Curated annotation (Swiss-Prot), chain A:
This is Portal protein. Forms the portal vertex of the capsid. This portal plays critical roles in head assembly, genome packaging, neck/tail attachment, and genome ejection. The portal protein multimerizes as a single ring-shaped homododecamer arranged around a central channel. Binds to the terminase subunits to form the packaging machine. Attaches to the host inner membrane most likely through interaction with host yidC and forms together with chaperone gp40 an initiator complex to form the prohead. Transmembrane segments: none annotated. It comes from the Viruses. Belongs to the Tevenvirinae portal protein family. It is found in: Virion; Host cell inner membrane. Homododecamer. Interacts with the large terminase subunit. Interacts with the major capsid protein. Interacts with the capsid vertex protein.
Curated annotation (Swiss-Prot), chain B:
It comes from the Viruses. Major capsid protein that self-associates to form hexamers, building most of the capsid in association with pentons made of the capsid vertex protein and one dodecamer of the portal protein. The major capsid protein self-associates to form 160 hexamers, building most of the T=13 laevo capsid. Folding of major capsid protein requires the assistance of two chaperones, the host chaperone groL acting with the phage encoded gp23-specific chaperone, gp31. The capsid also contains two nonessential outer capsid proteins, Hoc and Soc, which decorate the capsid surface. It comes from Enterobacteria phage T4 (Bacteriophage T4). Homohexamer. Interacts with the portal protein. Interacts with the capsid vertex protein that forms pentamers. Interacts with hoc; one hoc molecule associates with each capsid hexamer. Interacts with soc; this interaction reinforces the capsid structure. A total of 960 subunits of the major capsid protein forms the 160 hexamers. This is Major capsid protein.
């Protein structure tokens, strides 16, 4: 059911390609939820540039917090300024939607920059010489 | 003691406390804030001097 | 004394006389006070506060 949900047989190549290029892929996870047991359905791949990974520490000790820093690790996702390679139109609106970690299917590369947790593309190596 | 929530008014004018109540029913609060629009950005520049 | 049927076994009292019990240890002891938790002091959920 899962590979059919992803339409793997027609789109596996596209999902993989976007992931390779961007190094992050996400899908919105579906649930009924009145009859949650039957809720898994074809998922919605989410766009890069609209998604951000966010974690928070809630716990405290002396001279810095050194106890169960659970982090949560949830996501933020929005629309907003959907205009770049396509000249888009929209009005002004606030967005910033918070999505539970459990609510999203996602994978990413092991390629990270010098600091932080900024995940980079498999093509990152090629940017210099490509240009 | 698990009985009442304790909060601080960092701008209290002098020294004092107030006791409130809020029920499980969000409507049952005495006082409420009810937004329908918030924090919506505005951006551009003024051509008379083109400053943002 | 005056009845010959048994000693008092219930109390009906103002809220103030219940709050004062809820906040203290009414058993036999040295000293005792704090938050009003021993009895319900509300009227919203019951009338019966508890057994002293």
């Amino acid at each position: 059911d899962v590979l059919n949900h992803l339409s793997f047989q027609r789109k596996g190549s596209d999902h993989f390609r976007r992931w390779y290029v961007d190094s992050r892929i996400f899908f919105h996870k579906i649930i009924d939820p009145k009859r949650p047991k039957e809720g898994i359905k074809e998922l919605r791949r989410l766009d890069p540039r609209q998604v951000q990974y966010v974690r928070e520490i809630i716990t405290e000790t002396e001279a810095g917090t050194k106890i169960v820093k659970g982090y949560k690790e949830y996501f933020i996702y929005d629309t907003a300024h959907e205009s770049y390679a396509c000249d888009g139109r929209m009005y002004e609106a606030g967005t910033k939607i918070k999505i539970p970690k459990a609510a999203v299917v996602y994978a990413h590369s092991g390629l990270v920059d010098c600091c932080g947790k900024n995940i980079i593309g498999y093509l990152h190596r090629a940017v210099k010489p490509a240009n | 003691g698990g009985k009442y929530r304790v909060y601080i008014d960092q701008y209290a004018k002098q020294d004092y406390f107030t006791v409130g109540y809020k029920g499980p029913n969000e409507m049952d609060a005495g006082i409420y804030y009810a937004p329908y629009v918030a924090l919506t950005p505005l951006r551009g520049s003024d051509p008379k001097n083109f400053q943002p | 004394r005056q009845t010959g049927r048994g000693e008092g076994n219930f109390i009906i009292a103002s809220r103030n006389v219940v709050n004062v019990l809820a906040s203290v240890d009414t058993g036999i002891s040295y000293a005792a006070q704090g938050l009003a938790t021993g009895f319900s002091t509300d009227t919203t959920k019951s009338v019966f506060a508890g057994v002293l």
